[PDB]
Amino acid sequence: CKQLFTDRQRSWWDAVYSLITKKALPGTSAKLRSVIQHDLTTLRAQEKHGLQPAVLVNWARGLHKTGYSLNSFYDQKEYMGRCVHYWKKLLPLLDLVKQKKSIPEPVDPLFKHFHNKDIKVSEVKDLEDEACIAFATLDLVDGKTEDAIIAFESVKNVVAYWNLALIYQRKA
Amino acid sequence: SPSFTEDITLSAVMLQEEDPGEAATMSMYPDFLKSFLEHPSSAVFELIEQYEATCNTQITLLKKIVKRVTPGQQKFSKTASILWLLQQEMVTWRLIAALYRDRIQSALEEENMFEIAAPNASEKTIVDKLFQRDTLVRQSQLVVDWLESIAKDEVGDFSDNIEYYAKSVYWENTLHTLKQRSMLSLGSSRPLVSELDPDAPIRQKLPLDDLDREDDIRLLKYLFTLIRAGMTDEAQRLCKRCGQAWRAATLEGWKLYHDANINGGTELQAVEGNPYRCVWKTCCWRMAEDEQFNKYERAIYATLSGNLKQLLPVCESWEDTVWAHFKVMVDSLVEQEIRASIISFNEANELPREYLEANWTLDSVFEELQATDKKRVLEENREHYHIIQKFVILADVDGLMDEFSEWLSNGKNLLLGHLLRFMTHLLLFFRTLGLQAKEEVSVEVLKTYIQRLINEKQIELIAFYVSHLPQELAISQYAVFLENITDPDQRQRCLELAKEAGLDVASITKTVVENTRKKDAGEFAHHDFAPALDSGTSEEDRAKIDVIDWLVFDPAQRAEALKQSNAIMRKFLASKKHEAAKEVFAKIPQDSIAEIYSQWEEQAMDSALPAEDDNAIREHLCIRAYLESHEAFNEWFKHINSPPQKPTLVGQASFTEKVAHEHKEKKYEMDFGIWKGHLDALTSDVKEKIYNVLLFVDGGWMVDVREDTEEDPERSHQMVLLRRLCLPMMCFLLHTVLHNTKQYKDCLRLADIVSSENQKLYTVFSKTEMRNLLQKLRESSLMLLDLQLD
Amino acid sequence: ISESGAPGRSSLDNVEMAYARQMYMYNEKVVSGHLQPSLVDLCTEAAERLDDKNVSDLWVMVKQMTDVPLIPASDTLKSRCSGQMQMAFVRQALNYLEQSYKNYTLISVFANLQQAQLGGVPGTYNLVRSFLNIRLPTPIPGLQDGEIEGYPVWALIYYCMRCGDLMAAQQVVNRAQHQLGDFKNCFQEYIHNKDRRLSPTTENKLRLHYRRAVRASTDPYKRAVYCIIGRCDVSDNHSEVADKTEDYLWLKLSQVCFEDEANSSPQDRLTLPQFQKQLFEDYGESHFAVNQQPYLYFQVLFLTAQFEAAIAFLFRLERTRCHAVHVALALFELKLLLKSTGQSAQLLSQEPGEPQGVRRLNFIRLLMLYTRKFEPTDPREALQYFYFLRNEKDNQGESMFLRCVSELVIESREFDMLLGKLEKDGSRKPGAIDKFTRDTKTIINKVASVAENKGLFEEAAKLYDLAKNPDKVLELTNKLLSPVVSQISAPQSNRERLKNMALAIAERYKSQGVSAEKSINSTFYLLLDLITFFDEYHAGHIDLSFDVIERLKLVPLSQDSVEERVAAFRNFSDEIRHNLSEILLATMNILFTQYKRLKGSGPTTLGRPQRVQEDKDSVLRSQARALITFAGMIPYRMSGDTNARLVQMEVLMN
């Protein structure tokens, strides 16, 4: 079981590891840092976008699984911030897969394009609920508890009430 | 696609101003080119069918985009204008296809034969016989049917729109008033009617109810719109739905029996019509003379009769005008040829002698159309699409080319990209069919089309249209097209497109490089010319070094590539650019001549072997020798600047100091050994290469073998001057390099090689360089004398 | 379209001119420090003073609607998330719709005058009665009980309800003693209770009576009154669909409530998105024939809480985008309009879960199009727009306001009155932008740095001279004179004149005031001497170049001077190390010319005695030895050609 994806991800990981451990070349260090910064910006999705709805949903699911499994404070806040930063750009991509149109696939194949086809209207309600949860959590972090609890009572998701119970226990 | 539907549904209600017209115009070109390459000129029917399908598609797209908002702004106004121009272009394409079909059908029967002239019963047989005697009435009725189809297509879904308000009961108010008058003696204090028939008031000359008159006028408007389109089924359907079938029953008297029944088994088809068409058209002429009714009945009576005096204001549009004119002239001709040849005692149509003794042709139509005194028709006969239609119908050439010349002199203030594409396609179809135009207007059309193409960009559409141009102009324009090409992906895409279309992109790039060199006019020719005062590099060197990218991007013409490389290397050596020369030499491989002769021997063509291969071999060898000499010289100077690998006393007074001194001495000895070894090897190679040039009088660098070469006589003389100036310089540089190598066995001849073979006086040998290098030799000899040597 | 910025002084709109003047006065008051009243009242008084009446009344209505006691929110997202402010704004919109109907009745009375079928009489009840007599004085079919002075009691009650005159309704109820049934007490309670509290049992009984009997009478006014009283359905239409949607909207808002009050139950209330969709689709543009009167559409859109829809509608009109931007900046001052990124998308953007009408306004795209549709305009409106652009914080490096002002200054290239006049090398002056904003020195420095990075020389030098920065002035001077040193310096174009005037400005600035650092001044003097020797050599003179290069006292003179030359070379700069190539080239050219002249001149004849020739040869030997020792023991190497020419001149003088 070796390489179950695309060599681009392996090359990016190797470049990141080399730039971190200072195992690259001082001559091309400038262009290496530039490429790493561009890739990090594209991954964070704050200025340049071009990913996939499936990989963004996977990002959100992994972030939720890594955050709600522990009992922290600032770590959970950073996880929710990353979640809302991903959702603010996944929502426009999710608006296109609801009408049974074309999947917004990038020009560079990052994974095997044979299973990441988002066109089935099944968990779109759960995705919208998670996006609303991220929005309400960002509002509560920014000091908008009223709007946060209003959105939480409006939506119907178990993650919302779990985060609410965790916040209430921490406050107590 | 549901994307278009949802987009127009959102745009019909949104409050934004989005114009996808530019995107539609940019996307219609690749689809049109794909349809053109899929359907050639052979299957013209299927080609025009797919064209009409795609054109109706984009017309629906543009009309939806327009109707999605109120066209009040300039952008949407121009969009509606473009939509109308597209409708007109498509109707002109339909007319062109119809005319081409008619010409193809007539080309097989241009020549005929007459032998039967005895008449028989039923004038339909005489009409069918005369139809094959002259094609004028043939194309006349063809244009008539084409206009009828145009009206039918323009009517649209009116048959379904009628159902939204079709009535059923009529004369309700009249019946109520009559009932009131009969039951109470009141309610009709006005010129009342007698019967409830549509002809009773028009016979008694007393009307009633203005609302009923307005409803009848609207119903007559509907009947006129249904009949003008060439429909009768929907007409009688509406008649049976409402109750006014009297108009449909009356509009059935100008027909004729179809005498074709010969037995009882055949169906009875000779029941429609009447032999009283003469008195019918006479009564219609009298009605048109004393016309005093509504405009619609006046126009229908004018069309059924043919009185031009009252038809002049009856004609509403140019289509109706030309239809009425064609019908009138063909009817006059047919009735004249039928009556004057058989019997002429009762004039069915009151035509005087001035109209009876006049054979109408085809130019008279355009004559009266231009002579139309109406301002509307005068303005319509001076635009663009009307004159295009007129020229297409007339099949002229002189006036057409004159108007095209006036258009070209005016400029692009009327034509557009789609217009130019349609014109180019029409010209190509005409040239494929028959005849041609002029070379000047042809090359003007081609250059305008390729200019519009390069303005619209899309590199996937330029190669598929450049091939239609003549080879010379096509290559000359593809040169400028490829001069501005970047990105490796786009470069390889253009390469694949050219290879698929069949264009010689290799020779195109070669001509590009040749034109750039001719525009630069070289750099100090091929002779060492020092610049005046202090100055940097030339402004053309940047372009010369940047043009090598697209040249090396295609590894196929290695011979010409190395020839141009040697040319630019000579130019750089003349204009002082040894650094760039060294960088280019390090970038290019060393087995260039090897690959050259390998390709030459693999192409299986040794019968026409010139001297360019040997010239390139000699040029590359001389360039490599000069670069090796220069690198050896600068390495020797850098080693002289560095400590000369000698135990130099720098202060020794401790154990660590003496250990460091011994280590430095060992390192210096090793470096000196390596330096002497490699310098002796390189200098022995340079001397072995030089020994074959010393015996010559002139020189021996960048020379030629025999005739038939790429170099010019002027370039040959420049290279001869350069080699004559460089031979003593190269020999002196070799002697200077061969000095500190501690091997004077091959240097002891320096005391006599100065005044050796020199028949030519020191004139054009550049006194500065030779004096400087002789001084360098003297300094090296003094250094060797200090280091113990003669 | 809109009132774009005219190039310089020209002709603009009086409305925009007055608004810019009022914004200038507001900025002046802000700079002074005194508390400002409100720009809304100033805009209202300006619209009242101007000859325009329709837009003046529109802005009066907008001001009277915004002057409601509501808490100022932060963004449209927060406004739509908060629930209390939504119902408060809905109640205020209903009250203002009642007031607007009362004002329309007053206007109709003023138009009908007094002596015209019982004209208007002072007093609310008398005015309502006069309006009823003007509309329909005849008894409408479907009358119950009696009448008040022969007037339809049901129509009078409906008119009182539509006008909102609760005191007039109370007077009508008190006057209708025996002219009505046993519902006078219910009417009085419904009028006196603002929250509509008239017993739930009585409300249910009235609803049942309306559903049973009052369902087919010929009195639309009575039917609507009974429906409003009984609280039935959500919409009850009789004969209001006739280019008068105000009454229909009022009835819908009165029959539909967001919060559950008295007699509240399903199938009797709706949501705000429902009315939004109803007004956007069925009552949209080119649907209900409302394009001829866009003011009513804008009013109903602002009343139904559709600020983004109203802004888009006002922007879509002709000669109205200016007023749209004005109301947008007014709402921004009042703290509204949610910010949204995007520079190429449309203005109306939304997210999954947002209703129609309340969308996310793309403020970034709005500012982008506003800046793109403008030309080099007047400085007053420029500062008025900068006062609003500076309110935005940093967004992905720098700021949008800074980028906009940089683009504007690099497109205008003018600062003699906006930033400060210059006599020849003076300081800065309190310009227009300086009299309102501080940090002017840093702003000018950043602008000049941006101009230098783009490709500006003379204007950037003038800007730095105005901002008083000798370090940066000398830095840019050296950076602009370094590449020209490599090429020729003869008067052939304009670059030499530009560098000459720049050098003159720099030297006069250094003479009048404190110059730059020690190394910077040393490099400046070095470059001055070098360009002097360069022009002296290019002019065709050799002895002058020789004597100036000997008096420079910085070239390698002798072996004892090579040491100090190398010691001083370690304290040079990149330009001082780069121009050495051209310096040595010019030196070797001059030396070769001198040697050629000496060789052409006879040793014993044609002048020049043998002793002078020997002295010149010895000084050439010394100069060559010093130069070659320098070039050999400096820790810097260049190219093979330069090295070969160096050794060539070394042995020529050797």
PDB file of N, CA and C in Angstrom, chain B residues 322-383:
ATOM      1  N   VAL B 322     -42.168  44.448 -53.137  1.00  0.00           N
ATOM      2  CA  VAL B 322     -41.534  43.645 -54.177  1.00  0.00           C
ATOM      3  C   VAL B 322     -42.401  42.443 -54.536  1.00  0.00           C
ATOM      4  N   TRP B 323     -43.137  41.887 -53.568  1.00  0.00           N
ATOM      5  CA  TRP B 323     -44.044  40.785 -53.871  1.00  0.00           C
ATOM      6  C   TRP B 323     -45.154  41.235 -54.811  1.00  0.00           C
ATOM      7  N   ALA B 324     -45.764  42.388 -54.520  1.00  0.00           N
ATOM      8  CA  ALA B 324     -46.817  42.908 -55.385  1.00  0.00           C
ATOM      9  C   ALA B 324     -46.280  43.233 -56.771  1.00  0.00           C
ATOM     10  N   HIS B 325     -45.082  43.818 -56.845  1.00  0.00           N
ATOM     11  CA  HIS B 325     -44.498  44.145 -58.144  1.00  0.00           C
ATOM     12  C   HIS B 325     -44.236  42.886 -58.961  1.00  0.00           C
ATOM     13  N   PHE B 326     -43.636  41.870 -58.334  1.00  0.00           N
ATOM     14  CA  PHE B 326     -43.362  40.617 -59.029  1.00  0.00           C
ATOM     15  C   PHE B 326     -44.652  39.963 -59.507  1.00  0.00           C
ATOM     16  N   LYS B 327     -45.662  39.899 -58.633  1.00  0.00           N
ATOM     17  CA  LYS B 327     -46.931  39.294 -59.020  1.00  0.00           C
ATOM     18  C   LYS B 327     -47.570  40.048 -60.177  1.00  0.00           C
ATOM     19  N   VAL B 328     -47.561  41.383 -60.118  1.00  0.00           N
ATOM     20  CA  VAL B 328     -48.174  42.185 -61.172  1.00  0.00           C
ATOM     21  C   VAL B 328     -47.470  41.946 -62.501  1.00  0.00           C
ATOM     22  N   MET B 329     -46.133  41.954 -62.494  1.00  0.00           N
ATOM     23  CA  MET B 329     -45.412  41.817 -63.755  1.00  0.00           C
ATOM     24  C   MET B 329     -45.561  40.413 -64.335  1.00  0.00           C
ATOM     25  N   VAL B 330     -45.507  39.375 -63.492  1.00  0.00           N
ATOM     26  CA  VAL B 330     -45.642  38.022 -64.023  1.00  0.00           C
ATOM     27  C   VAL B 330     -47.064  37.780 -64.514  1.00  0.00           C
ATOM     28  N   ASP B 331     -48.065  38.349 -63.831  1.00  0.00           N
ATOM     29  CA  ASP B 331     -49.438  38.206 -64.295  1.00  0.00           C
ATOM     30  C   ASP B 331     -49.645  38.929 -65.619  1.00  0.00           C
ATOM     31  N   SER B 332     -49.099  40.141 -65.750  1.00  0.00           N
ATOM     32  CA  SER B 332     -49.201  40.862 -67.013  1.00  0.00           C
ATOM     33  C   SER B 332     -48.561  40.071 -68.145  1.00  0.00           C
ATOM     34  N   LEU B 333     -47.349  39.555 -67.916  1.00  0.00           N
ATOM     35  CA  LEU B 333     -46.656  38.801 -68.957  1.00  0.00           C
ATOM     36  C   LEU B 333     -47.428  37.542 -69.338  1.00  0.00           C
ATOM     37  N   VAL B 334     -47.924  36.805 -68.341  1.00  0.00           N
ATOM     38  CA  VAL B 334     -48.622  35.550 -68.615  1.00  0.00           C
ATOM     39  C   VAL B 334     -49.917  35.814 -69.374  1.00  0.00           C
ATOM     40  N   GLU B 335     -50.715  36.776 -68.899  1.00  0.00           N
ATOM     41  CA  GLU B 335     -51.974  37.082 -69.569  1.00  0.00           C
ATOM     42  C   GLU B 335     -51.744  37.612 -70.979  1.00  0.00           C
ATOM     43  N   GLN B 336     -50.687  38.402 -71.185  1.00  0.00           N
ATOM     44  CA  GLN B 336     -50.393  38.890 -72.527  1.00  0.00           C
ATOM     45  C   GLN B 336     -50.011  37.743 -73.455  1.00  0.00           C
ATOM     46  N   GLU B 337     -49.068  36.898 -73.024  1.00  0.00           N
ATOM     47  CA  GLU B 337     -48.634  35.782 -73.856  1.00  0.00           C
ATOM     48  C   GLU B 337     -49.747  34.770 -74.094  1.00  0.00           C
ATOM     49  N   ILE B 338     -50.740  34.709 -73.211  1.00  0.00           N
ATOM     50  CA  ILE B 338     -51.861  33.795 -73.405  1.00  0.00           C
ATOM     51  C   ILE B 338     -52.919  34.395 -74.323  1.00  0.00           C
ATOM     52  N   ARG B 339     -53.213  35.688 -74.172  1.00  0.00           N
ATOM     53  CA  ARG B 339     -54.286  36.305 -74.942  1.00  0.00           C
ATOM     54  C   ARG B 339     -53.846  36.632 -76.363  1.00  0.00           C
ATOM     55  N   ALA B 340     -52.728  37.354 -76.514  1.00  0.00           N
ATOM     56  CA  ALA B 340     -52.303  37.796 -77.838  1.00  0.00           C
ATOM     57  C   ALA B 340     -51.954  36.636 -78.762  1.00  0.00           C
ATOM     58  N   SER B 341     -51.740  35.441 -78.217  1.00  0.00           N
ATOM     59  CA  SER B 341     -51.429  34.267 -79.021  1.00  0.00           C
ATOM     60  C   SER B 341     -52.647  33.401 -79.316  1.00  0.00           C
ATOM     61  N   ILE B 342     -53.746  33.580 -78.584  1.00  0.00           N
ATOM     62  CA  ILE B 342     -54.940  32.764 -78.781  1.00  0.00           C
ATOM     63  C   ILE B 342     -56.129  33.657 -79.114  1.00  0.00           C
ATOM     64  N   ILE B 343     -56.616  34.397 -78.124  1.00  0.00           N
ATOM     65  CA  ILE B 343     -57.812  35.219 -78.279  1.00  0.00           C
ATOM     66  C   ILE B 343     -57.669  36.453 -77.398  1.00  0.00           C
ATOM     67  N   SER B 344     -58.027  37.612 -77.951  1.00  0.00           N
ATOM     68  CA  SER B 344     -57.966  38.873 -77.208  1.00  0.00           C
ATOM     69  C   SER B 344     -59.151  39.729 -77.661  1.00  0.00           C
ATOM     70  N   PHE B 345     -60.299  39.514 -77.020  1.00  0.00           N
ATOM     71  CA  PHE B 345     -61.507  40.259 -77.349  1.00  0.00           C
ATOM     72  C   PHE B 345     -62.097  40.909 -76.104  1.00  0.00           C
ATOM     73  N   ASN B 346     -61.827  40.327 -74.937  1.00  0.00           N
ATOM     74  CA  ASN B 346     -62.329  40.835 -73.664  1.00  0.00           C
ATOM     75  C   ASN B 346     -61.149  41.004 -72.717  1.00  0.00           C
ATOM     76  N   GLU B 347     -60.756  42.253 -72.473  1.00  0.00           N
ATOM     77  CA  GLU B 347     -59.644  42.543 -71.575  1.00  0.00           C
ATOM     78  C   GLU B 347     -60.073  42.283 -70.137  1.00  0.00           C
ATOM     79  N   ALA B 348     -59.542  41.212 -69.540  1.00  0.00           N
ATOM     80  CA  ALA B 348     -59.883  40.893 -68.158  1.00  0.00           C
ATOM     81  C   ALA B 348     -59.319  41.932 -67.196  1.00  0.00           C
ATOM     82  N   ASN B 349     -58.073  42.345 -67.406  1.00  0.00           N
ATOM     83  CA  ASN B 349     -57.440  43.397 -66.620  1.00  0.00           C
ATOM     84  C   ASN B 349     -57.304  44.635 -67.495  1.00  0.00           C
ATOM     85  N   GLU B 350     -57.899  45.742 -67.049  1.00  0.00           N
ATOM     86  CA  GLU B 350     -57.924  46.985 -67.821  1.00  0.00           C
ATOM     87  C   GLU B 350     -56.513  47.565 -67.885  1.00  0.00           C
ATOM     88  N   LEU B 351     -55.724  47.043 -68.822  1.00  0.00           N
ATOM     89  CA  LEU B 351     -54.368  47.519 -69.056  1.00  0.00           C
ATOM     90  C   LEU B 351     -54.311  48.222 -70.401  1.00  0.00           C
ATOM     91  N   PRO B 352     -53.965  49.511 -70.449  1.00  0.00           N
ATOM     92  CA  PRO B 352     -53.934  50.223 -71.733  1.00  0.00           C
ATOM     93  C   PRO B 352     -52.790  49.776 -72.632  1.00  0.00           C
ATOM     94  N   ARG B 353     -52.604  50.482 -73.749  1.00  0.00           N
ATOM     95  CA  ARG B 353     -51.558  50.110 -74.696  1.00  0.00           C
ATOM     96  C   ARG B 353     -50.167  50.306 -74.108  1.00  0.00           C
ATOM     97  N   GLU B 354     -49.988  51.319 -73.255  1.00  0.00           N
ATOM     98  CA  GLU B 354     -48.675  51.568 -72.668  1.00  0.00           C
ATOM     99  C   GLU B 354     -48.221  50.410 -71.789  1.00  0.00           C
ATOM    100  N   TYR B 355     -49.165  49.659 -71.220  1.00  0.00           N
ATOM    101  CA  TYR B 355     -48.838  48.475 -70.438  1.00  0.00           C
ATOM    102  C   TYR B 355     -48.942  47.185 -71.238  1.00  0.00           C
ATOM    103  N   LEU B 356     -49.663  47.195 -72.361  1.00  0.00           N
ATOM    104  CA  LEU B 356     -49.770  45.998 -73.186  1.00  0.00           C
ATOM    105  C   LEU B 356     -48.572  45.831 -74.114  1.00  0.00           C
ATOM    106  N   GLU B 357     -47.981  46.929 -74.574  1.00  0.00           N
ATOM    107  CA  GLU B 357     -46.829  46.873 -75.474  1.00  0.00           C
ATOM    108  C   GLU B 357     -45.544  47.216 -74.721  1.00  0.00           C
ATOM    109  N   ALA B 358     -45.297  46.459 -73.653  1.00  0.00           N
ATOM    110  CA  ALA B 358     -44.107  46.664 -72.831  1.00  0.00           C
ATOM    111  C   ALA B 358     -43.759  45.349 -72.154  1.00  0.00           C
ATOM    112  N   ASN B 359     -42.596  44.793 -72.490  1.00  0.00           N
ATOM    113  CA  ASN B 359     -42.134  43.537 -71.909  1.00  0.00           C
ATOM    114  C   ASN B 359     -41.315  43.847 -70.662  1.00  0.00           C
ATOM    115  N   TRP B 360     -41.874  43.541 -69.495  1.00  0.00           N
ATOM    116  CA  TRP B 360     -41.193  43.804 -68.235  1.00  0.00           C
ATOM    117  C   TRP B 360     -40.078  42.791 -68.011  1.00  0.00           C
ATOM    118  N   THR B 361     -38.966  43.265 -67.448  1.00  0.00           N
ATOM    119  CA  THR B 361     -37.819  42.407 -67.179  1.00  0.00           C
ATOM    120  C   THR B 361     -37.534  42.336 -65.685  1.00  0.00           C
ATOM    121  N   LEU B 362     -36.253  42.290 -65.319  1.00  0.00           N
ATOM    122  CA  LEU B 362     -35.843  42.216 -63.923  1.00  0.00           C
ATOM    123  C   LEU B 362     -35.217  43.499 -63.400  1.00  0.00           C
ATOM    124  N   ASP B 363     -34.552  44.276 -64.258  1.00  0.00           N
ATOM    125  CA  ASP B 363     -33.935  45.520 -63.813  1.00  0.00           C
ATOM    126  C   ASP B 363     -34.964  46.595 -63.493  1.00  0.00           C
ATOM    127  N   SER B 364     -36.162  46.515 -64.081  1.00  0.00           N
ATOM    128  CA  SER B 364     -37.192  47.509 -63.801  1.00  0.00           C
ATOM    129  C   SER B 364     -37.629  47.469 -62.343  1.00  0.00           C
ATOM    130  N   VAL B 365     -37.551  46.298 -61.707  1.00  0.00           N
ATOM    131  CA  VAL B 365     -37.899  46.192 -60.291  1.00  0.00           C
ATOM    132  C   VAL B 365     -36.983  47.078 -59.457  1.00  0.00           C
ATOM    133  N   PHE B 366     -35.668  46.901 -59.614  1.00  0.00           N
ATOM    134  CA  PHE B 366     -34.716  47.756 -58.912  1.00  0.00           C
ATOM    135  C   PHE B 366     -34.850  49.209 -59.345  1.00  0.00           C
ATOM    136  N   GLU B 367     -35.200  49.447 -60.610  1.00  0.00           N
ATOM    137  CA  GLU B 367     -35.399  50.814 -61.083  1.00  0.00           C
ATOM    138  C   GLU B 367     -36.490  51.517 -60.285  1.00  0.00           C
ATOM    139  N   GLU B 368     -37.679  50.913 -60.211  1.00  0.00           N
ATOM    140  CA  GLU B 368     -38.760  51.542 -59.458  1.00  0.00           C
ATOM    141  C   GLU B 368     -38.480  51.538 -57.959  1.00  0.00           C
ATOM    142  N   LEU B 369     -37.741  50.541 -57.459  1.00  0.00           N
ATOM    143  CA  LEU B 369     -37.403  50.523 -56.039  1.00  0.00           C
ATOM    144  C   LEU B 369     -36.508  51.698 -55.671  1.00  0.00           C
ATOM    145  N   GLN B 370     -35.540  52.022 -56.530  1.00  0.00           N
ATOM    146  CA  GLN B 370     -34.709  53.197 -56.299  1.00  0.00           C
ATOM    147  C   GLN B 370     -35.461  54.488 -56.586  1.00  0.00           C
ATOM    148  N   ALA B 371     -36.433  54.451 -57.499  1.00  0.00           N
ATOM    149  CA  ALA B 371     -37.212  55.637 -57.831  1.00  0.00           C
ATOM    150  C   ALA B 371     -38.368  55.884 -56.870  1.00  0.00           C
ATOM    151  N   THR B 372     -38.578  55.004 -55.889  1.00  0.00           N
ATOM    152  CA  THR B 372     -39.598  55.213 -54.865  1.00  0.00           C
ATOM    153  C   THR B 372     -39.470  56.593 -54.234  1.00  0.00           C
ATOM    154  N   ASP B 373     -40.493  57.432 -54.414  1.00  0.00           N
ATOM    155  CA  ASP B 373     -40.454  58.800 -53.913  1.00  0.00           C
ATOM    156  C   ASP B 373     -40.692  58.892 -52.412  1.00  0.00           C
ATOM    157  N   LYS B 374     -41.046  57.791 -51.755  1.00  0.00           N
ATOM    158  CA  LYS B 374     -41.281  57.822 -50.318  1.00  0.00           C
ATOM    159  C   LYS B 374     -39.962  57.954 -49.565  1.00  0.00           C
ATOM    160  N   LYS B 375     -39.966  58.797 -48.528  1.00  0.00           N
ATOM    161  CA  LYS B 375     -38.751  59.017 -47.750  1.00  0.00           C
ATOM    162  C   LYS B 375     -38.329  57.755 -47.008  1.00  0.00           C
ATOM    163  N   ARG B 376     -39.298  56.968 -46.534  1.00  0.00           N
ATOM    164  CA  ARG B 376     -38.971  55.732 -45.831  1.00  0.00           C
ATOM    165  C   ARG B 376     -38.237  54.759 -46.745  1.00  0.00           C
ATOM    166  N   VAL B 377     -38.760  54.549 -47.956  1.00  0.00           N
ATOM    167  CA  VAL B 377     -38.103  53.645 -48.892  1.00  0.00           C
ATOM    168  C   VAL B 377     -36.776  54.223 -49.366  1.00  0.00           C
ATOM    169  N   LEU B 378     -36.692  55.549 -49.516  1.00  0.00           N
ATOM    170  CA  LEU B 378     -35.435  56.166 -49.923  1.00  0.00           C
ATOM    171  C   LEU B 378     -34.354  55.960 -48.868  1.00  0.00           C
ATOM    172  N   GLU B 379     -34.726  56.032 -47.588  1.00  0.00           N
ATOM    173  CA  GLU B 379     -33.759  55.787 -46.524  1.00  0.00           C
ATOM    174  C   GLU B 379     -33.444  54.304 -46.383  1.00  0.00           C
ATOM    175  N   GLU B 380     -34.415  53.432 -46.668  1.00  0.00           N
ATOM    176  CA  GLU B 380     -34.168  51.998 -46.570  1.00  0.00           C
ATOM    177  C   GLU B 380     -33.306  51.493 -47.722  1.00  0.00           C
ATOM    178  N   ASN B 381     -33.325  52.183 -48.862  1.00  0.00           N
ATOM    179  CA  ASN B 381     -32.513  51.806 -50.008  1.00  0.00           C
ATOM    180  C   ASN B 381     -31.106  52.395 -49.955  1.00  0.00           C
ATOM    181  N   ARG B 382     -30.647  52.822 -48.773  1.00  0.00           N
ATOM    182  CA  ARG B 382     -29.316  53.404 -48.648  1.00  0.00           C
ATOM    183  C   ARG B 382     -28.545  52.872 -47.445  1.00  0.00           C
ATOM    184  N   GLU B 383     -29.062  51.868 -46.739  1.00  0.00           N
ATOM    185  CA  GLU B 383     -28.385  51.357 -45.552  1.00  0.00           C
ATOM    186  C   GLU B 383     -27.326  50.326 -45.922  1.00  0.00           C
TER     187      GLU B 383
END
